Amino acid sequence: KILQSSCDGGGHFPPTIQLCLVSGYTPGTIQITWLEDGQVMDVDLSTASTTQEGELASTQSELTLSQKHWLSDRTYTCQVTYQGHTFEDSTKKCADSNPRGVSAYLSRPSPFDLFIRKSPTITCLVVDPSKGTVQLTWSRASGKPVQHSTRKEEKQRNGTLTVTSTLPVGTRDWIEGETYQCRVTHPHLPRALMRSTTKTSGPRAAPEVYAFATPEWPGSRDKRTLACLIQNFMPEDISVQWLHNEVQLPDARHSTTQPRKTKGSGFFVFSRLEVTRAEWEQKDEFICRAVHEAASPSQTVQRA
Amino acid sequence: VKILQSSCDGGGHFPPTIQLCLVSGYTPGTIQITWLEDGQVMDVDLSTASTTQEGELASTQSELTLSQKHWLSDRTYTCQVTYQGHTFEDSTKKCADSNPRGVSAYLSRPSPFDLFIRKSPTITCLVVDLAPSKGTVQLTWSRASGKPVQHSTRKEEKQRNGTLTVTSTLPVGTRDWIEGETYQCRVTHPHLPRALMRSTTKTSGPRAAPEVYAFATPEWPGSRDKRTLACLIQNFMPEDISVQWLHNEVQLPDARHSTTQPRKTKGSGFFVFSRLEVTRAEWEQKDEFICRAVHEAASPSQTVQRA
Amino acid sequence: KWINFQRKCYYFGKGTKQWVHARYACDDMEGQLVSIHSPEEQDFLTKHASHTGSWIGLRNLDLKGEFIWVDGSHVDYSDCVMMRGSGRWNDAFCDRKLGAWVCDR
Ligand SMILES: *[C@@H]1O[C@H](CO)[C@@H](O[C@@H]2O[C@H](CO)[C@@H](O[C@@H]3O[C@H](CO)[C@@H](O)[C@H](O)[C@@H]3O)[C@H](O)[C@H]2NC(C)=O)[C@H](O)[C@H]1NC(C)=O
Ligand SMILES: *[C@@H]1O[C@H](CO)[C@@H](O)[C@H](O)[C@H]1NC(C)=O
């Protein structure tokens, strides 16, 4: 049974939140893993301690969390692995008696899928359960036929059902200006919820890519940082990728900031990449490729 | 001594039975534990006491069982500890619901420029309200210890998207913030069933000096008079950072200059990017652009600048 | 109530509070946090010292870097600094809580 940190006299939340407490069991090797709505958290944040009392063994884990992380409405799960079964226990911030309605989100396809991969896809993420009667109907603005979407449902640990529908859209059809409609129906909801997205019609501008390298700093020798600036482009849709030895580096390695407006019409994005001594010695060339709607030639703007 | 309440399930629903209290280590001796209900002594049969000796210091824990109707009725429980010096007190109360009807409040820490250079630190409470109806957004201010606070500038700005946003700027002490004082805030609305409580303090933990890097963009076809300046400030903790742009010994305002949100490095530290656009008349008159960065761990005198 | 030594009065308060919260308690009881300058003064504090630890009037302003006492006097005889059960001092966290505090007037 998980035990959370209590609030003060007034009812105000403390800056640091402490969780978890595991009951007595038969002596043996145990595995404690922290989760954040189906995502494994860092082991350094939690502290483990085992104490033997009489015949049964007791263990306690303590995870420290900030006030902004706990009050952001996120469910934490303590995964216990012993004898190859697994025992789950979830903890959440004090909530109301089920407020608001069912919300659906329809996102535009990324420029990588639209130009490089040539396979653009639209995902309909709907957050909800009483009964498994969530229907996702697909239709077009003109009245053209559509292919069947991959309807996959994932029941979350917080007691909610999330079903995604991936529809394969045409490459030439999206650039021309086709609007894709979606219909979501539920017995609890009175009116039929409908969400539709299309190509962001407005001004078009070619992005300006700038490559920068950081010099040697006292303390660091093996590791170096690469900074990239992509500015003056509309719409906000942009794909940032780093290249080394003609091949694309993984998405986890490079970090990209949210599209922010310039002091002018356009948008700007910053890219950061951390590289080791073995990378530049083998090949001293780092090119950051940017994919955009108005980009030329063939929607590819790259700078070394 | 610290009181630990029973956690809610996955959905956020309250459990039928609530378990509280935990008392820290002390010098061996006879102790007295008494349970209170807003200044009223509760029955001894409801609570269970157990003493455990660990090394040299003795540890004791009390567990009081309460029904869901008793805990959610908005009542404060106090654990009175009597040992040598007379009395000791720690209070526990119900947690106010977060995001009621799509209403979120944000309380930010004061920027290092206002804390060290300007010497006037201020805390802003930005609350986003999606449904602007007949009622008030009362922003009550209080301290963790119970010290008096000055009146905050309550200004409301109705946005074009159909939402109301009210900000409360509270003037906090310079020496009080560094020492470790926690500032509490209470948000109430007549249409909303439950209140909103958000509190912030000085992030006590590891300290690291920021690494400032200055860069200039070359000539691009189309643009001739205007040029852009890029700055990188990395490897620093906590996330609180102030970014300033200087030209002819005079600082530049919030306009032209743009700074990204503090993002985590693949490591311990944090990183921020700064962008500034300059005209041909600026570099010809003076070809020097210094970007100033203010941080808690920064040296010398909380000033790290690069040209 | 205050136990006397040399000429200065000393109060040995008990209760789980932070360094800043313990500082307000000394102000309400007419005075301020304990400041040590004499080597013989440390011997008296060890006699009434708590096993958990007691908060002392040593703090960091960060602007200068060096540690200065609560009143404003420079440190001669030897992040919020606490006093151990043995006698010697060590660096500790600002948000950290202890069940003992010492005030002087
Ligand atoms: C139970 O846990 C799940 C975790 O998967 C929570 O679902 C998450 O809910 C948020 C808020 O509705 C979703 O974020 C939204 O994403 C869209 C698309 O990127 C964006 O446009 C919105 O601005 C927003 O950030 C998030 O995608 C969603 N996660 C998944 C995988 O569906 C769920 O809300 C939790 N339940 C409760 C009651 O808190
Ligand atoms: C409305 O505008 C404000 C501007 O500050 C923004 O913060 C908010 O997210 C906007 N709301 C919606 C629904 O876009």
PDB file of N, CA, C and O and ligand atoms in Angstrom, chain A residues 36-39 72-75 92 95 98-99 103-107 123 125-128 154 156-164, chain B residues 10-12, ligand 1:
ATOM      1  N   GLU A  36       5.338   6.017 -14.698  1.00  0.00           N
ATOM      2  CA  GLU A  36       4.667   7.302 -14.894  1.00  0.00           C
ATOM      3  C   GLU A  36       3.730   7.145 -16.103  1.00  0.00           C
ATOM      4  O   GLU A  36       4.106   7.467 -17.236  1.00  0.00           O
ATOM      5  N   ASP A  37       2.521   6.594 -15.845  1.00  0.00           N
ATOM      6  CA  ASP A  37       1.468   6.290 -16.827  1.00  0.00           C
ATOM      7  C   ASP A  37       1.949   5.369 -17.967  1.00  0.00           C
ATOM      8  O   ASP A  37       1.661   5.606 -19.143  1.00  0.00           O
ATOM      9  N   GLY A  38       2.680   4.324 -17.581  1.00  0.00           N
ATOM     10  CA  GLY A  38       3.240   3.329 -18.490  1.00  0.00           C
ATOM     11  C   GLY A  38       4.629   3.654 -19.005  1.00  0.00           C
ATOM     12  O   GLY A  38       5.023   3.154 -20.063  1.00  0.00           O
ATOM     13  N   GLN A  39       5.381   4.494 -18.264  1.00  0.00           N
ATOM     14  CA  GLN A  39       6.744   4.908 -18.615  1.00  0.00           C
ATOM     15  C   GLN A  39       7.671   4.754 -17.411  1.00  0.00           C
ATOM     16  O   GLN A  39       7.416   5.347 -16.362  1.00  0.00           O
ATOM     17  N   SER A  72       0.055  17.940 -11.924  1.00  0.00           N
ATOM     18  CA  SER A  72      -0.177  17.961 -13.374  1.00  0.00           C
ATOM     19  C   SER A  72      -1.140  16.851 -13.846  1.00  0.00           C
ATOM     20  O   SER A  72      -1.333  16.682 -15.055  1.00  0.00           O
ATOM     21  N   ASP A  73      -1.756  16.120 -12.886  1.00  0.00           N
ATOM     22  CA  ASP A  73      -2.695  15.010 -13.089  1.00  0.00           C
ATOM     23  C   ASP A  73      -2.061  13.828 -13.838  1.00  0.00           C
ATOM     24  O   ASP A  73      -2.401  13.551 -14.993  1.00  0.00           O
ATOM     25  N   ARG A  74      -1.113  13.149 -13.167  1.00  0.00           N
ATOM     26  CA  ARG A  74      -0.402  11.984 -13.694  1.00  0.00           C
ATOM     27  C   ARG A  74      -0.355  10.853 -12.670  1.00  0.00           C
ATOM     28  O   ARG A  74      -0.019  11.082 -11.505  1.00  0.00           O
ATOM     29  N   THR A  75      -0.715   9.637 -13.111  1.00  0.00           N
ATOM     30  CA  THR A  75      -0.781   8.435 -12.280  1.00  0.00           C
ATOM     31  C   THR A  75       0.572   7.729 -12.207  1.00  0.00           C
ATOM     32  O   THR A  75       1.181   7.444 -13.242  1.00  0.00           O
ATOM     33  N   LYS A  92      -2.611   8.411  -7.528  1.00  0.00           N
ATOM     34  CA  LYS A  92      -2.998   9.613  -8.268  1.00  0.00           C
ATOM     35  C   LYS A  92      -3.406  10.750  -7.330  1.00  0.00           C
ATOM     36  O   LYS A  92      -3.769  10.509  -6.174  1.00  0.00           O
ATOM     37  N   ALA A  95      -8.871  13.766  -7.239  1.00  0.00           N
ATOM     38  CA  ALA A  95      -9.704  14.241  -8.345  1.00  0.00           C
ATOM     39  C   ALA A  95     -11.205  14.244  -8.024  1.00  0.00           C
ATOM     40  O   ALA A  95     -11.638  13.598  -7.067  1.00  0.00           O
ATOM     41  N   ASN A  98     -15.546  12.265 -11.623  1.00  0.00           N
ATOM     42  CA  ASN A  98     -15.512  12.166 -13.089  1.00  0.00           C
ATOM     43  C   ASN A  98     -16.023  13.426 -13.837  1.00  0.00           C
ATOM     44  O   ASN A  98     -17.158  13.430 -14.325  1.00  0.00           O
ATOM     45  N   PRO A  99     -15.207  14.506 -13.935  1.00  0.00           N
ATOM     46  CA  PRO A  99     -15.675  15.715 -14.638  1.00  0.00           C
ATOM     47  C   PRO A  99     -15.399  15.705 -16.145  1.00  0.00           C
ATOM     48  O   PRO A  99     -14.710  14.808 -16.640  1.00  0.00           O
ATOM     49  N   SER A 103     -12.841  13.651 -25.073  1.00  0.00           N
ATOM     50  CA  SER A 103     -12.083  14.516 -25.982  1.00  0.00           C
ATOM     51  C   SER A 103     -11.300  13.736 -27.035  1.00  0.00           C
ATOM     52  O   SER A 103     -10.627  12.756 -26.709  1.00  0.00           O
ATOM     53  N   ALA A 104     -11.389  14.186 -28.297  1.00  0.00           N
ATOM     54  CA  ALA A 104     -10.703  13.583 -29.441  1.00  0.00           C
ATOM     55  C   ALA A 104      -9.699  14.557 -30.055  1.00  0.00           C
ATOM     56  O   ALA A 104      -9.989  15.750 -30.175  1.00  0.00           O
ATOM     57  N   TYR A 105      -8.521  14.044 -30.445  1.00  0.00           N
ATOM     58  CA  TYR A 105      -7.449  14.839 -31.044  1.00  0.00           C
ATOM     59  C   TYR A 105      -7.012  14.249 -32.384  1.00  0.00           C
ATOM     60  O   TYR A 105      -6.663  13.068 -32.451  1.00  0.00           O
ATOM     61  N   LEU A 106      -7.042  15.073 -33.446  1.00  0.00           N
ATOM     62  CA  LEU A 106      -6.643  14.675 -34.796  1.00  0.00           C
ATOM     63  C   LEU A 106      -5.456  15.533 -35.250  1.00  0.00           C
ATOM     64  O   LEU A 106      -5.595  16.747 -35.425  1.00  0.00           O
ATOM     65  N   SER A 107      -4.281  14.895 -35.399  1.00  0.00           N
ATOM     66  CA  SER A 107      -3.031  15.555 -35.784  1.00  0.00           C
ATOM     67  C   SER A 107      -2.677  15.399 -37.263  1.00  0.00           C
ATOM     68  O   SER A 107      -2.946  14.354 -37.860  1.00  0.00           O
ATOM     69  N   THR A 123      -3.331  10.319 -37.361  1.00  0.00           N
ATOM     70  CA  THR A 123      -3.696   9.573 -36.155  1.00  0.00           C
ATOM     71  C   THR A 123      -4.774  10.309 -35.358  1.00  0.00           C
ATOM     72  O   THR A 123      -4.615  11.493 -35.051  1.00  0.00           O
ATOM     73  N   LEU A 125      -6.339  10.340 -31.907  1.00  0.00           N
ATOM     74  CA  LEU A 125      -6.190   9.969 -30.501  1.00  0.00           C
ATOM     75  C   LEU A 125      -7.378  10.492 -29.681  1.00  0.00           C
ATOM     76  O   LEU A 125      -7.513  11.703 -29.494  1.00  0.00           O
ATOM     77  N   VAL A 126      -8.241   9.575 -29.207  1.00  0.00           N
ATOM     78  CA  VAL A 126      -9.417   9.915 -28.400  1.00  0.00           C
ATOM     79  C   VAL A 126      -9.281   9.411 -26.955  1.00  0.00           C
ATOM     80  O   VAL A 126      -9.046   8.221 -26.731  1.00  0.00           O
ATOM     81  N   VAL A 127      -9.398  10.334 -25.985  1.00  0.00           N
ATOM     82  CA  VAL A 127      -9.283  10.044 -24.553  1.00  0.00           C
ATOM     83  C   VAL A 127     -10.680   9.863 -23.944  1.00  0.00           C
ATOM     84  O   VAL A 127     -11.523  10.755 -24.060  1.00  0.00           O
ATOM     85  N   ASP A 128     -10.911   8.704 -23.298  1.00  0.00           N
ATOM     86  CA  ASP A 128     -12.175   8.351 -22.649  1.00  0.00           C
ATOM     87  C   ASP A 128     -11.948   8.082 -21.162  1.00  0.00           C
ATOM     88  O   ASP A 128     -11.444   8.944 -20.447  1.00  0.00           O
ATOM     89  N   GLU A 154      -5.790   0.790 -26.210  1.00  0.00           N
ATOM     90  CA  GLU A 154      -4.854   0.560 -25.113  1.00  0.00           C
ATOM     91  C   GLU A 154      -5.472   1.033 -23.793  1.00  0.00           C
ATOM     92  O   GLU A 154      -5.597   2.240 -23.564  1.00  0.00           O
ATOM     93  N   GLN A 156      -5.436   2.015 -20.174  1.00  0.00           N
ATOM     94  CA  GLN A 156      -4.438   2.584 -19.268  1.00  0.00           C
ATOM     95  C   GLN A 156      -4.663   2.196 -17.808  1.00  0.00           C
ATOM     96  O   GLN A 156      -5.784   1.858 -17.420  1.00  0.00           O
ATOM     97  N   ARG A 157      -3.583   2.236 -17.004  1.00  0.00           N
ATOM     98  CA  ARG A 157      -3.586   1.893 -15.578  1.00  0.00           C
ATOM     99  C   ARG A 157      -4.429   2.825 -14.694  1.00  0.00           C
ATOM    100  O   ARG A 157      -4.845   2.414 -13.610  1.00  0.00           O
ATOM    101  N   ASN A 158      -4.704   4.061 -15.168  1.00  0.00           N
ATOM    102  CA  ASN A 158      -5.510   5.041 -14.430  1.00  0.00           C
ATOM    103  C   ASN A 158      -7.036   4.848 -14.558  1.00  0.00           C
ATOM    104  O   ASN A 158      -7.801   5.623 -13.983  1.00  0.00           O
ATOM    105  N   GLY A 159      -7.452   3.823 -15.303  1.00  0.00           N
ATOM    106  CA  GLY A 159      -8.858   3.483 -15.510  1.00  0.00           C
ATOM    107  C   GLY A 159      -9.530   4.167 -16.684  1.00  0.00           C
ATOM    108  O   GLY A 159     -10.730   4.450 -16.623  1.00  0.00           O
ATOM    109  N   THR A 160      -8.769   4.435 -17.765  1.00  0.00           N
ATOM    110  CA  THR A 160      -9.277   5.074 -18.988  1.00  0.00           C
ATOM    111  C   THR A 160      -8.901   4.268 -20.231  1.00  0.00           C
ATOM    112  O   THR A 160      -7.833   3.653 -20.268  1.00  0.00           O
ATOM    113  N   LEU A 161      -9.771   4.291 -21.255  1.00  0.00           N
ATOM    114  CA  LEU A 161      -9.539   3.593 -22.518  1.00  0.00           C
ATOM    115  C   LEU A 161      -9.127   4.593 -23.599  1.00  0.00           C
ATOM    116  O   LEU A 161      -9.812   5.598 -23.805  1.00  0.00           O
ATOM    117  N   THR A 162      -7.988   4.330 -24.259  1.00  0.00           N
ATOM    118  CA  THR A 162      -7.460   5.190 -25.318  1.00  0.00           C
ATOM    119  C   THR A 162      -7.319   4.399 -26.618  1.00  0.00           C
ATOM    120  O   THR A 162      -6.496   3.482 -26.702  1.00  0.00           O
ATOM    121  N   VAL A 163      -8.138   4.751 -27.620  1.00  0.00           N
ATOM    122  CA  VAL A 163      -8.138   4.106 -28.932  1.00  0.00           C
ATOM    123  C   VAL A 163      -7.649   5.062 -30.035  1.00  0.00           C
ATOM    124  O   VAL A 163      -8.133   6.191 -30.140  1.00  0.00           O
ATOM    125  N   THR A 164      -6.650   4.613 -30.813  1.00  0.00           N
ATOM    126  CA  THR A 164      -6.045   5.380 -31.905  1.00  0.00           C
ATOM    127  C   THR A 164      -6.391   4.784 -33.265  1.00  0.00           C
ATOM    128  O   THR A 164      -6.409   3.560 -33.416  1.00  0.00           O
TER     129      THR A 164
ATOM    130  N   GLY B  10      -5.723   4.426  -8.957  1.00  0.00           N
ATOM    131  CA  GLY B  10      -5.408   4.834 -10.325  1.00  0.00           C
ATOM    132  C   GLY B  10      -6.288   5.929 -10.895  1.00  0.00           C
ATOM    133  O   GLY B  10      -5.783   6.861 -11.526  1.00  0.00           O
ATOM    134  N   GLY B  11      -7.593   5.818 -10.659  1.00  0.00           N
ATOM    135  CA  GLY B  11      -8.587   6.785 -11.116  1.00  0.00           C
ATOM    136  C   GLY B  11      -8.573   8.101 -10.365  1.00  0.00           C
ATOM    137  O   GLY B  11      -8.961   9.134 -10.917  1.00  0.00           O
ATOM    138  N   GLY B  12      -8.131   8.053  -9.110  1.00  0.00           N
ATOM    139  CA  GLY B  12      -8.064   9.210  -8.223  1.00  0.00           C
ATOM    140  C   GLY B  12      -9.105   9.178  -7.122  1.00  0.00           C
ATOM    141  O   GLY B  12      -9.213  10.132  -6.345  1.00  0.00           O
TER     142      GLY B  12
HETATM  143  C1  LIG D   1      -4.381   8.368 -17.928  1.00  0.00           C
HETATM  144  O1  LIG D   1      -3.061   8.312 -18.469  1.00  0.00           O
HETATM  145  C2  LIG D   1      -2.984   8.669 -19.858  1.00  0.00           C
HETATM  146  C3  LIG D   1      -1.534   8.510 -20.256  1.00  0.00           C
HETATM  147  O2  LIG D   1      -1.414   7.944 -21.552  1.00  0.00           O
HETATM  148  C4  LIG D   1      -3.522  10.086 -20.061  1.00  0.00           C
HETATM  149  O3  LIG D   1      -3.610  10.366 -21.458  1.00  0.00           O
HETATM  150  C5  LIG D   1      -2.967  11.530 -21.967  1.00  0.00           C
HETATM  151  O4  LIG D   1      -3.823  12.676 -21.849  1.00  0.00           O
HETATM  152  C6  LIG D   1      -3.248  13.903 -22.330  1.00  0.00           C
HETATM  153  C7  LIG D   1      -4.252  15.000 -22.047  1.00  0.00           C
HETATM  154  O5  LIG D   1      -5.525  14.733 -22.625  1.00  0.00           O
HETATM  155  C8  LIG D   1      -2.882  13.770 -23.808  1.00  0.00           C
HETATM  156  O6  LIG D   1      -2.195  14.943 -24.235  1.00  0.00           O
HETATM  157  C9  LIG D   1      -2.671  15.636 -25.380  1.00  0.00           C
HETATM  158  O7  LIG D   1      -2.001  15.183 -26.562  1.00  0.00           O
HETATM  159  C10 LIG D   1      -2.403  15.848 -27.773  1.00  0.00           C
HETATM  160  C11 LIG D   1      -1.684  15.157 -28.911  1.00  0.00           C
HETATM  161  O8  LIG D   1      -0.274  15.128 -28.721  1.00  0.00           O
HETATM  162  C12 LIG D   1      -2.100  17.343 -27.668  1.00  0.00           C
HETATM  163  O9  LIG D   1      -2.581  18.011 -28.830  1.00  0.00           O
HETATM  164  C13 LIG D   1      -2.779  17.925 -26.430  1.00  0.00           C
HETATM  165  O10 LIG D   1      -2.427  19.295 -26.274  1.00  0.00           O
HETATM  166  C14 LIG D   1      -2.420  17.136 -25.173  1.00  0.00           C
HETATM  167  O11 LIG D   1      -1.061  17.365 -24.813  1.00  0.00           O
HETATM  168  C15 LIG D   1      -1.997  12.545 -24.030  1.00  0.00           C
HETATM  169  O12 LIG D   1      -1.786  12.357 -25.426  1.00  0.00           O
HETATM  170  C16 LIG D   1      -2.655  11.295 -23.445  1.00  0.00           C
HETATM  171  N1  LIG D   1      -1.832  10.121 -23.690  1.00  0.00           N
HETATM  172  C17 LIG D   1      -2.194   9.121 -24.510  1.00  0.00           C
HETATM  173  C18 LIG D   1      -1.129   8.117 -24.832  1.00  0.00           C
HETATM  174  O13 LIG D   1      -3.327   9.034 -24.973  1.00  0.00           O
HETATM  175  C19 LIG D   1      -4.903  10.230 -19.420  1.00  0.00           C
HETATM  176  O14 LIG D   1      -5.359  11.574 -19.532  1.00  0.00           O
HETATM  177  C20 LIG D   1      -4.866   9.817 -17.948  1.00  0.00           C
HETATM  178  N2  LIG D   1      -6.189   9.935 -17.352  1.00  0.00           N
HETATM  179  C21 LIG D   1      -6.525  10.877 -16.457  1.00  0.00           C
HETATM  180  C22 LIG D   1      -7.943  10.842 -15.974  1.00  0.00           C
HETATM  181  O15 LIG D   1      -5.723  11.716 -16.056  1.00  0.00           O
END
